[PDB]
Structures are given as structure tokens and as C-alpha cells.
Design a protein around this nucleic acid. Structure first.
Ligand SMILES: [Mg+2]
Ligand SMILES: [Mg+2]
Ligand SMILES: [Mg+2]
Ligand SMILES: [Mg+2]
Ligand SMILES: [Mg+2]
Ligand SMILES: [Mg+2]
Ligand SMILES: [Mg+2]
Ligand SMILES: [Mg+2]
Ligand SMILES: [Mg+2]
Ligand SMILES: [Mg+2]
Ligand SMILES: [Mg+2]
Ligand SMILES: [Mg+2]
Ligand SMILES: [Mg+2]
Ligand SMILES: [Mg+2]
Ligand SMILES: [Mg+2]
Ligand SMILES: [Mg+2]
Ligand SMILES: [Mg+2]
Ligand SMILES: [Mg+2]
Ligand SMILES: [Mg+2]
Ligand SMILES: [Mg+2]
Ligand SMILES: [Mg+2]
Ligand SMILES: [Mg+2]
Ligand SMILES: [Mg+2]
Ligand SMILES: [Mg+2]
Ligand SMILES: [Mg+2]
Ligand SMILES: [Mg+2]
Ligand SMILES: [Mg+2]
Ligand SMILES: [Zn+2]
Ligand SMILES: [Zn+2]
Lengths: 129, 96, 206, 25, 97, 81, 120, 217, 87
RNA sequence: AGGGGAUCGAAGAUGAUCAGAUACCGUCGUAGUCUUAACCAUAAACUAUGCCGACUAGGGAUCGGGUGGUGUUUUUUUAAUGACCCACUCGGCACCUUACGAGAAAUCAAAGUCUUUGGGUUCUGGGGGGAGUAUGGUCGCAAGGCUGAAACUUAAAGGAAUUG
């Protein structure tokens, strides 16, 4: 059985870019998936996506141009106290200049920089760079 | 993800799994079973003073051919008998 | 910019049907080739030559795009394209390679079968594999003649053709040498049923 | 010695030792 | 390590195949791994077929032969019959010839 | 092939694909008003019957179960509407 | 059983590579050529060198052979070309196949026609 | 007398190409050392390690001498040359030459601010030669190169002033960890960081502009 | 690749493929650069004037150098009907 | 524990071989081999390769199901059929070519999508011997199975590959 639908979409995207391709259909388009694909386009790692409507769980077609090195999901949605968010960025982000480590908080899914801006925290979702 | 369970609630298995698997570490096992005190004629101490029983000359292992001067010592705090080498050529005349 | 009426002329069309280039490969197709138009049963797939013309306009567009037309190469180890490559290299600046390749020609600058072309053309990537996989190591591009079964690996703009036939290898060597000069280089600007005759390349039997 | 023969040698050895202390059972 | 991807001959997805026994030494060998050679040799020889037919009734009516399938054990197969130990990459060629 | 409209594919390539491997799921089975010229008002049958349906008033076998090719014996007419 | 060494063979090709104006098909003439055109060290050596060049030059007047690189042959045959005009284009009007005719009806114009219907 | 083959080798003598950055911009394959020797003559020679290798032959036991040397200015260009000859010198001379061809650029960077003089790297890079995986991590200024003597003196010539190193594998075989650390810095200019997303005009290069200048004969 | 006082530090901004949009580095001696010359009235290919395209060595490797190029030429207008967007 | 016991055949006894020859080769032949009822539960029980899920690549064969037809054959009088041909699709046993990629390598469409390290989950391993030994527990009629140490000893043992 599929366990973390987010991963089955993220990994396909990562696979789809080193393949050279610039389009990939991801399944099965969860609400969390769209609220993640949204944050990536907010920083320009992907382009535009379209929510196909099967009468089933869904489908998404996302166009990525050339800018993502590694998108990823963190399986245990580890709870991150605001005091150790820096500890994550350090472990999985190329440099403190760029790259965002998305997470889920009470204030809604948001990247780490936006999370530090609003001073709110939650569990970690993944990262993108 | 080959191996270990990753769920956020598998902490009990992870800790007991490592506890069990740590027995493969000889330093960890020797320190837990306590061989230092049971085995190991020194009582786990840095040194142990004893009494010399006889002056032995031990043929060196190969590919060497010498006669290592040692002495069989009977630990006073333990009664155990142990053969120990006398370094610093000469020094066998000093054991007495 | 779509340049001109350069699109395939109604007479240049028949110049290819009798030439055998619409009968491409048999029911074999590297998935990399959409150049196949609705196929024909009992065998071979028919090519949509409407692109092959565009292929040559682009091919020639770059062939005659090297400020040193002298250092552009054309190769056919398969002797069908030899009477064609040398005859192509004649109406060019292009330096040819016909016969045996003498591998290690782009690398190993101390060999004297060595060249440094800024563009290269081959007939059958299969037979001339050494050529394409050698350009790979030196940043140089390649224009490829290609049937439906030819491997598009490491090749730049390709040209749908039939490398399994009697005369359709000279057709494009001619049209390439025809449009390479119908482009800058003195030639006829009009319909131009070009002076030289298509039967010139014509790999011979003996 | 062969691997399976070391097994047989050991199996015999334990059978003999097994018997030896059953005398003191 | 392995020196053939089959590690035997012709057996992937069956677990066990009834074993045949070598023609030369009778040693057992799994049918899938036994080298097979069908021996179709006639009752003929170079100069034996002309004597056979002239001084006889039935002026060359049928002329039939011997038909039997042989299975060898690799050890025996290597000794006399077709083994012809190949090279590292020359062995992957299953061309009978 | 590194550029491909996934949203708008050809009505030919998707026609070749599998029932469930299309863009949006869709059953490739239809219905037909089978006309047996022995009765006035005839039945509406499914492409893969699995049941040799019988008409309203008579016993005139029209289909026969198969692997999905409901065989309409008693050569008749029909309509994919 | 005397195959000439490649020392002489390497030399023979290197001279036919640059002295075809000279180097007549006769040994004696070629022999007295080496004493003046080459720096060989012995009669016997240059004798097989010249004696070989002769055989090579004797065959070039028959056809080409591997190793000849005097740059004259490439300018010799690339103009020996331009054979018989029989381009097809009279052949009835035009022979085509059942669907090959439909090929450029999308963008091209009319042309002569012919039908072909085959079966496996 | 230079007398160059590989016409780009003429584009260097004729001073129509002043810096190797053009060569990289269009990735041209350098096939002669005087190119690098002229584009940057202040290269340093540092023989990293000299190891003997032995081969058994039908007529003896050959004992070739393998040498590894790394060249670089100390400003962003290093090459790793390794080869073996029957003599240490000859192997050092040949390898000291190969080290020039191997030269590649090193994209340095800043650790966490914008203040001038880039010391550290832009991202974390991973060298993966053989069995040793070398990893360069951006370290703040005043940290230095934290790595074994060989990797440290390789990055020193690379021009990086502060970087965190973390290796894995059989590091004792330095012939492989040096090649790994090389690929590590070699991968520095492969990270599509956000600043470099800006589309460039894709300039034409000395290949076609000075075409009439190469003009071999 | 700026610095504190606006200067352009971090020399050699590299090339970039147009299909994959990935970096074309120095040791990528498998990449290419094709210059299509600008054509004018009745042939007359304009020399010294091109619209240059660059492809990574990786795309060339997988064989999609040609097919992913027909599209590139058509999205600039130098072919008429060669590569569709669906099949 | 019955039956069966033709065959081949541990044991044993022989004939030959060898310095020796408890063997290999030959002969005899017990148990066995087979079957019923009850046990035993181990095999290099092997793909020396956990399962469920997803993604990533080209290729022609083939098994099963299916769809498509103014395809060929059966001629009956042509269909209906049946078998064959072609194209496609789902699930099989595999093979082939590639390498982006992986690996210490041999090689691997997984053994890939990893220092740019996190889909779910089970199990096992932590230098070599000592030793699967000792000891307890438990299973079995036994033979044995499962669970399973340590003292001491030792600098290598090992893997794939290269040259000889
Ligand atoms: Mg607090
Ligand atoms: Mg253990
Ligand atoms: Mg004593
Ligand atoms: Mg006491
Ligand atoms: Mg021993
Ligand atoms: Mg008793
Ligand atoms: Mg072996
Ligand atoms: Mg088997
Ligand atoms: Mg088995
Ligand atoms: Mg003189
Ligand atoms: Mg050292
Ligand atoms: Mg019996
Ligand atoms: Mg006996
Ligand atoms: Mg013997
Ligand atoms: Mg005897
Ligand atoms: Mg015995
Ligand atoms: Mg017997
Ligand atoms: Mg077991
Ligand atoms: Mg097995
Ligand atoms: Mg497998
Ligand atoms: Mg093992
Ligand atoms: Mg496949
Ligand atoms: Mg049918
Ligand atoms: Mg299948
Ligand atoms: Mg490989
Ligand atoms: Mg590899
Ligand atoms: Mg020792
Ligand atoms: Zn046998
Ligand atoms: Zn009915």
C-alpha cells in the first residue's frame, strides 16, 4: 500500500528532472500535494500544474523547467521546536543562502524562511533546492 | 527503506533493537558481563602486586628465536598465578 | 522567422520518390522517430518527407554557417555514400572522410588522419559509429542521415531517409550540396533546377 | 578437513560426551 | 563468483526438474542441465552401402537409420562429446553450429 | 519524450492505451439496442453480457456468455446508442 | 621464404609518397636513384628498398594500394566521375503505393498517380 | 619553439584568447599544456605522493613508479595529474604535465553573509571516486581547510580559504581520495543555484569568431 | 554572484543548455554548440550572424538531441511542420 | 507398525588394482528404495538476492486473457466456426542491447532513483579462531531439531579483480 502520497509525487518529480524531461503526471494529487507544489512555484523550482479531475483521488500534471536539484519528503513528520529549525536546514540544505525546508505548522504549510518570519512551527514535511 | 521501522512511534523497537544488537560489541559486552572482575586475574585494577614463584625462560614465538626471561607470579590479592615478562635486559638477576 | 517559399517545391518532391527515400526502414523504429507518417502494411513505414526537406534546410543552414567552410566534414564508411561524400566535398569547402575511418582521429592529435572539424556529417551512425562517438569527446556537433532503424544517440538534427536502398543517399548529399550553395555561395535564386544532375553522387557497382 | 566431516566428527564427539555423563545421570 | 547467469542450463522459475542419467557413466543430471545431442546415424558407412544394395532384393526400398536422444553429464560431456570449453565471452553464444 | 503534452494527448495514442491507463478513467464497454426482427420492442444489452439475455415475452436466445465478446446469434441489428 | 622487413617496406612507401615524377618502373634506374635521393647504408639494403619500390610502382599502374599518399590520387579520381544520365525521369508517369500517395496531400500539390495494393 | 597542433593552440599564441574562462564557457578540450601554462604561468608544483607498482611479465618483474601531483594558482584553478613511469622524475615530469590539462575551475563563495572576498564554497560538494566519498561543506571564515594533509594542500592550491571536509571510505588509498576531492571541487560549478538562473545570450566562441585566425595548413 | 559593495565576484558564469536548462561545465566535453546562420532573401545565408543553441552532453547521450531540437527550432520559427506536441 | 520387496543399492563379503587400497572399477547383497498409519523438520530447501507501494529504458521472442478485420486457409456452395496472420493492451517465465545510474569489483532494470543521505514494514550481521562448542531450557522413539555463551587465543581471515 502507498504510505505517504506526498513522496510518490515528489520522487516522481525528482526522477522526472534528471531524466531531462520537463513534464510529469503525478498521482494521486492530495490536498497536501497541491499545497506543496504551490510553495515550490512560489520560489520558481517548477512552473505551472493542472489538477485533473478524475472522479477518483485525483491526478496532477506539473511542468518543471530546469532549476530543481533535489526535492524531498521527510517520512517521520518529526515535530520541530522553533529552537531547532536551524538544525534541519544545516543537515539537508546546500548553504544557508538558498534552499527551503518546507514544513507543516498551525499557520499552514510554509517554507522555513516564511516560518521564521511568522514565528510559528510544527512538523517537518520535506525540502526543495 | 531497507531495514529499521521509520514510523514516528517505533521508538521502543529502535531502542530495544540497538540494546540487543549492542551485545556484538566486545567492549560493551566485556564491560557489561564484568569479565574484568571474574576473568582477567588483575581484579580490573591498573596493576596488581604479587610474589614470584619461579624464574622462567620462554622461547620466543616464530619467526623469532630468543629466550624471553619471565617470572611466574602469584597475585597476593587474588591467589591466582600469572607469568609475566622481565624487560630491560638484565633485570632477571634482580627478581631473586 | 519563416524565411521564404523555401518549403519543398512540387518538383523537388518527385526528385525523391524515384530516388527511394520514402520507403524508410521496415517495421523497426527507434521510439525517438516520429518522422514516420501513417505507415504502410506488408513491411516498411513511409516517411513524411515534408520534414526531411525542412531537415536539409536546417542542416544546410548550419553546414554553411561555419566561417571556415573548409573545416566541415562529411563521412560515409559505407561505400554507398563515398561516391557521394567526395562529390559533396567537391561542391563545398568541406573536407571529406571516405573509406575507412582510421579511429582515434579527433583525439590523438599526433595521428595524421587527424582533423578538427567544427561540424561533421555521417550517413549511417551504425556503420560510422566510431565517428559519432568520437565527436562526443570533443564538443563538435554532427548532422545525421537516418533511416527508421538508425540510433539517434549522440546525434544533432537528423534527416529521415532510407539507408537501405539503391540511390537515396546521394539525393540529400545533392540537395545538401545544392542548398548549401543555394544559401550564401553563388547559385540560382529562382526555382533553380540546379545545373548539376542528381545522378552525380550515385554510388557505383564496378 | 572437510566441512561436513567436521560436523560428523563433532556429532560423534557430542554423542560420546553425552553418553559419558549419562553414566553419572 | 558466478561464471554463468543460468548457473546450470535452461531453468528459471521451476524449482526442480526430474533428473536424467548420463549415457557414458550413468551419473544423474537434471534434464534441464543435461547436454542433449540427438544421434541420427545411418546403418551406412563409406563403402558398406554399395555391397548392401547390389546383391539384394528390394533395390534400395527405404534405407532407414538409428534415432535416439543422448543426455550426458557435464563431466562426461567435457571428456569426449561437445563441450569444447569456450572463452569468457565466447561461451555466451548458444549458436549450435 | 522530454517534451510532451500530458494534458492534451492524441485521441489515437490514448485510444491504444489501457482502459485505466488513460488520462481520466473510462470504460471501453458500450450498450446496444439489439433488434431481433421477430418482435416489435426489443431489449438493450450490455457489451459483456455474462448472461444470455432473453426478451420480454419470448425465449429467443440473443446473446451467450463469453470472455466478453457477447456473441449475438440470431443475426440481428443493434446500435451503440 | 623472404618477406621483406618493414624497415625497407616503410621506406619504399615513404619515397613513392613523394617521388612519383621520378622512380621509373625499372629497378636499375631506381637503384641509382637511392644513392642520390636516400641515405641508405648498404648496397644490399638499398637493393631490396629499390627492388621493392619497383614492385609497388609496378602495381600502382594497375590500381591503388594501401599506403600510397602522394596527394595526386585524390585529385585524380574525384574528377574521373560524372557517369551516364538515365535519371528517373520517364517511367510511365509515376509509380506510387496505396497510402504513399496520401503522404503530402496535407501540404503538397497534385502529381502523377499509381495504385499498389499488397498483402502478406 | 611551441609549434602547435590543436588550432585552439594557435588562438593562444595569437593573443585572441586571454583567459581559460572562455575555454570553460564553451568547454573546449585542451590538448596541450602550454595553453594552461600560458593562460596562467604562476602554477605551483606539489608532488602529493609517490607509490611503487609492480607487474609480473613473462620476462621479469616491472617496477613502475606512480606519482600524483596537483597544480594550481591559489585562486580557483587546480589540476590533478597521476601517471607512472620507470623513473620517478619522468613520472613526475609527465604527471606534472597532466596536472595542467586536468585543471578545472573552482566556484568559491561566501558562508553566510555578503561581505567581500569569497573564501568558502557555494554549496556542499561530494567527490565520489573509487570507494572514498569526499565532502566539502561551506565553512565560515577563520575555519580553514579541515582535511588530511593531501586534501588540505589540494584545496589550498584550489584557492578556497575555509571549508569543512568529511570523507568516507578507504581514505588511506590517497590516490583515490585525492581524485575524489578533485571531483568534489570539480562539481562546484554544477550546482544550479538560484542566482545563476538568469538566461544568458549563449555567446559564440573563438571557434567561429577567430575562425580565419586558426587557419591550419 | 555579487558581493557586499555590488561588485561581480565569482568569475566564469557558465553556459546553459536550452532543452534541459542545466549547466554546461568545463569537463562536459560532450556538450555542443550549434550556430544556425540567418537566411535572407533568395538563399544568401548571412555569415557572422546566427542564433546560437547549446545542448548538454547528457541530452545528446540519451539520443533526444535531435527530437528535442526539432521543437527548439520550431519555437523560434525556423521550420514549418516537423515536431508536434503530442503522440 | 503393517504390507511390498521387481529394480538399483549405505552395510557387509568378495574379485581385481596399489608399496598399502577399508576405496574409486567388478561381483554378491542386508537395510533401503515403494505404499498405508504415525513421526522426524533438516538441504548449496539457491535467485547464496524479504514483502507491499511508487518512479526511472530501449528492444524483439514467448505463455494466458482480451480487443481490433471488405488479413490468408478449411470450400460445403460461401459463411458460422476452427487453426493461422497482423496491431494493441493487462498479467506471466525469460532473454537481448544500452547506461543515464549503481557497485570494491565480477556485474545489476535493480543490486538504480544515497554525504543532494528519510515511502511502509519484517529479519539478520559487527575481524578471525575458539564453536554452533559448553551450559540451562524445550521438541523427538531415537538420530537429532530449535534456543545458544564464555575463558583463552590470534593479525589477519576474507571478497572481487590484475598480473604471472
Ligand atoms: Mg523557550
Ligand atoms: Mg553472535
Ligand atoms: Mg610452570
Ligand atoms: Mg580482598
Ligand atoms: Mg588449522
Ligand atoms: Mg551407570
Ligand atoms: Mg571457481
Ligand atoms: Mg538447476
Ligand atoms: Mg530445490
Ligand atoms: Mg651522401
Ligand atoms: Mg603516505
Ligand atoms: Mg528389497
Ligand atoms: Mg565394502
Ligand atoms: Mg588408480
Ligand atoms: Mg582387497
Ligand atoms: Mg569399509
Ligand atoms: Mg551390482
Ligand atoms: Mg538453515
Ligand atoms: Mg541454485
Ligand atoms: Mg533478476
Ligand atoms: Mg554470504
Ligand atoms: Mg523494458
Ligand atoms: Mg478475432
Ligand atoms: Mg509484458
Ligand atoms: Mg558501465
Ligand atoms: Mg558506470
Ligand atoms: Mg607476523
Ligand atoms: Zn556422465
Ligand atoms: Zn430471448
Amino acid at each position: 500500500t502507498r504510505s505517504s502520497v506526498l513522496a510518490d509525487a515528489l520522487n516522481a518529480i525528482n526522477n522526472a528532472e534528471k531524466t531531462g524531461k520537463r513534464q510529469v503526471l503525478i498521482r494521486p494529487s492530495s490536498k497536501v500535494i497541491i499545497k506543496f507544489l504551490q510553495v515550490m512555484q512560489k520560489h520558481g523550482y517548477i512552473g505551472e500544474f493542472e489538477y485533473i479531475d478524475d472522479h477518483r483521488s485525483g491526478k496532477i500534471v506539473v511542468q518543471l523547467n530546469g532549476r530543481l536539484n533535489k526535492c524531498g519528503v521527510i517520512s517521520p513528520r518529526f515535530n520541530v521546536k522553533i529552537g531547532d529549525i536551524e538544525k534541519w536546514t544545516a543537515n539537508l540544505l546546500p548553504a544557508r543562502q538558498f534552499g527551503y525546508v518546507i514544513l507543516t505548522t498551525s499557520a499552514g504549510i510554509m517554507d522555513h524562511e516564511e516560518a521564521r518570519r511568522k514565528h510559528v512551527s510544527g512538523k517537518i514535511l520535506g525540502f526543495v533546492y | 527503506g531497507k531495514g529499521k521501522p521509520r514510523g514516528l512511534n517505533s521508538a521502543r523497537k529502535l531502542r530495544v533493537h540497538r540494546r540487543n544488537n549492542r551485545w556484538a560489541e566486545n567492549n560493551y559486552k566485556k564491560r557489561l558481563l564484568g569479565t574484568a572482575f571474574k576473568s582477567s586475574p588483575f581484579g580490573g585494577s591498573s596493576h596488581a602486586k604479587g610474589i614470584v614463584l619461579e624464574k622462567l625462560g620462554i622461547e620466543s614465538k616464530q619467526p623469532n628465536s630468543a629466550i624471553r626471561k619471565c617470572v611466574r607470579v602469584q597475585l597476593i590479592k587474588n591467589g591466582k598465578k600469572v607469568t609475566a615478562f622481565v624487560p630491560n635486559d638484565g633485570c632477571l638477576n634482580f627478581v631473586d | 522567422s519563416l524565411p521564404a517559399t523555401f518549403d519543398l517545391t512540387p518538383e523537388d518532391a518527385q526528385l525523391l520518390l524515384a530516388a527511394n527515400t520514402h520507403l524508410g526502414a521496415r517495421n523497426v523504429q527507434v521510439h525517438q522517430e516520429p518522422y514516420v507518417f501513417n505507415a504502410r502494411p506488408d513491411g516498411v513505414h513511409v516517411i513524411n518527407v515534408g520534414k526531411t526537406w525542412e531537415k536539409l534546410v536546417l542542416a544546410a543552414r548550419i553546414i554553411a554557417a561555419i566561417p571556415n567552410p573548409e573545416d566541415v566534414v562529411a563521412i560515409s564508411s559505407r561505400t554507398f555514400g563515398q561516391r557521394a561524400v567526395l562529390k559533396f566535398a567537391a561542391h563545398t569547402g568541406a573536407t571529406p572522410i571516405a573509406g575507412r575511418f582510421t579511429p582515434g582521429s579527433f583525439t590523438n592529435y599526433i595521428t595524421r588522419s587527424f582533423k578538427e572539424p567544427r561540424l561533421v556529417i555521417v550517413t549511417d551512425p551504425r556503420s560510422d559509429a566510431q565517428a559519432i562517438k568520437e565527436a562526443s569527446y570533443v564538443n563538435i556537433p554532427v548532422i545525421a542521415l537516418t533511416d527508421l532503424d538508425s540510433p539517434s544517440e549522440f546525434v544533432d538534427v537528423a534527416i529521415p531517409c532510407n539507408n537501405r536502398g539503391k540511390h537515396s543517399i546521394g539525393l540529400i548529399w545533392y540537395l545538401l550540396a545544392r542548398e548549401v550553395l543555394r544559401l550564401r555561395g553563388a547559385l540560382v535564386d529562382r526555382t533553380q533546377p540546379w545545373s548539376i544532375m542528381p545522378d552525380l553522387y550515385f554510388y557505383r557497382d564496378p | 578437513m572437510r566441512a561436513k566431516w567436521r560436523k560428523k566428527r563433532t556429532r560423534r564427539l557430542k554423542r560420546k560426551r553425552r553418553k559419558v555423563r549419562a553414566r553419572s545421570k | 563468483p558466478k561464471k554463468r547467469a543460468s548457473n546450470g542450463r535452461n531453468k528459471k522459475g521451476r524449482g526442480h526438474v526430474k533428473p536424467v542419467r548420463c549415457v557414458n557413466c550413468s551419473k544423474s543430471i537434471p534434464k534441464d542441465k543435461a547436454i542433449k545431442r540427438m544421434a541420427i546415424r545411418n546403418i551406412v558407412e563409406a563403402a558398406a552401402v554399395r555391397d548392401l544394395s547390389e546383391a539384394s532384393v528390394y533395390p534400395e526400398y527405404a534405407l532407414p537409420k538409428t534415432y535416439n536422444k543422448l543426455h550426458y553429464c557435464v563431466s562426461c560431456a567435457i571428456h569426449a562429446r561437445i563441450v569444447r570449453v569456450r572463452s569468457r565471452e565466447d561461451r555466451k553464444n548458444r549458436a549450435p553450429p | 519524450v522530454l517534451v510532451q503534452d500530458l494534458l492534451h494527448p492524441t485521441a489515437a495514442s490514448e485510444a491504444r492505451k489501457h482502459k485505466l491507463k488513460t488520462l481520466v478513467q473510462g470504460p471501453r464497454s458500450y450498450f446496444l439496442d439489439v433488434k431481433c426482427p421477430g418482435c416489435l420492442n426489443i431489449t438493450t444489452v450490455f457489451s459483456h453480457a455474462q448472461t444470455a439475455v432473453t426478451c420480454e415475452s419470448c425465449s429467443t436466445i440473443l446473446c451467450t456468455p463469453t470472455g466478453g465478446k457477447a456473441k449475438l446469434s440470431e443475426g440481428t441489428s443493434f446500435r451503440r446508442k | 621464404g623472404r618477406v621483406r622487413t618493414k624497415t625497407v617496406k616503410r621506406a619504399s612507401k615513404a619515397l613513392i609518397e613523394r617521388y612519383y615524377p621520378k622512380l621509373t618502373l625499372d629497378f636499375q634506374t631506381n637503384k641509382r636513384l637511392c644513392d642520390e635521393i636516400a641515405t641508405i647504408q648498404s648496397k644490399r639494403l638499398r637493393n631490396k628498398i629499390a627492388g621493392y619500390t619497383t614492385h609497388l610502382m609496378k602495381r600502382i599502374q594497375k590500381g591503388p594500394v594501401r599506403g600510397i599518399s602522394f596527394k595526386l590520387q585524390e585529385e585524380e579520381r574525384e574528377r574521373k566521375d560524372q557517369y551516364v544520365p538515365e535519371v528517373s525521369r520517364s517511367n510511365g508517369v509515376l509509380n506510387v503505393d496505396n497510402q504513399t500517395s496520401d503522404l503530402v496531400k496535407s501540404l503538397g500539390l497534385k502529381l502523377p498517380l499509381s495504385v499498389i495494393n499488397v498483402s502478406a | 619553439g611551441w609549434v602547435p597542433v590543436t588550432k585552439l593552440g594557435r588562438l593562444v599564441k595569437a593573443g585572441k584568447i586571454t583567459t581559460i574562462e572562455e575555454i570553460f564557457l564553451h568547454s573546449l578540450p585542451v590538448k596541450e599544456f602550454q595553453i594552461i601554462d600560458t593562460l596562467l604561468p604562476g602554477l605551483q608544483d606539489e608532488v602529493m605522493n609517490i607509490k611503487p607498482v609492480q607487474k609480473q611479465t613473462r620476462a621479469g618483474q616491472r617496477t613502475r613508479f606512480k606519482a600524483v601531483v596537483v597544480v594550481g594558482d591559489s585562486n580557483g584553478h587546480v589540476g590533478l595529474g597521476i601517471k607512472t613511469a620507470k623513473e620517478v622524475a619522468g613520472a613526475i615530469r609527465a604527471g606534472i604535465i597532466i596536472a595542467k590539462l586536468s585543471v578545472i575551475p573552482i566556484r568559491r563563495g561566501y558562508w553566510g553573509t555578503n561581505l567581500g572576498q569569497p573564501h568558502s564554497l557555494a554549496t556542499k560538494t561530494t567527490g565520489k571516486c573509487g570507494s572514498v566519498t569526499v565532502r566539502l561543506i561551506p565553512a565560515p571564515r577563520g575555519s580553514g581547510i579541515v582535511a588530511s594533509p593531501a586534501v588540505k594542500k589540494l584545496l589550498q592550491l584550489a584557492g578556497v580559504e575555509d571549508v569543512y571536509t568529511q570523507s568516507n571510505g578507504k581514505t588511506r588509498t590517497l590516490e583515490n581520495t585525492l581524485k575524489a576531492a578533485f571531483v568534489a571541487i570539480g562539481n562546484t560549478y554544477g550546482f544550479l543555484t538560484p542566482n545563476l538562473w538568469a538566461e544568458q545570450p549563449l555567446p559564440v566562441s573563438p571557434l567561429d569568431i577567430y575562425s580565419d585566425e586558426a587557419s591550419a595548413q | 554572484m555579487e558581493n557586499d559593495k555590488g561588485q561581480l565576484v565569482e568569475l566564469y558564469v557558465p553556459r546553459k543548455c536550452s532543452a534541459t536548462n542545466r549547466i554546461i561545465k568545463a569537463d562536459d566535453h560532450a556538450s555542443v554548440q550549434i550556430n544556425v546562420a540567418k537566411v535572407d532573401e533568395e538563399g544568401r545565408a548571412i555569415p557572422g550572424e546566427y542564433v546560437t543553441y547549446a545542448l548538454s552532453g547528457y541530452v545528446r547521450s540519451r539520443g533526444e538531441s535531435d527530437d528535442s531540437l526539432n521543437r527548439l527550432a520550431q519555437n523560434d520559427g525556423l521550420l514549418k511542420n516537423v515536431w508536434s506536441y503530442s503522440r
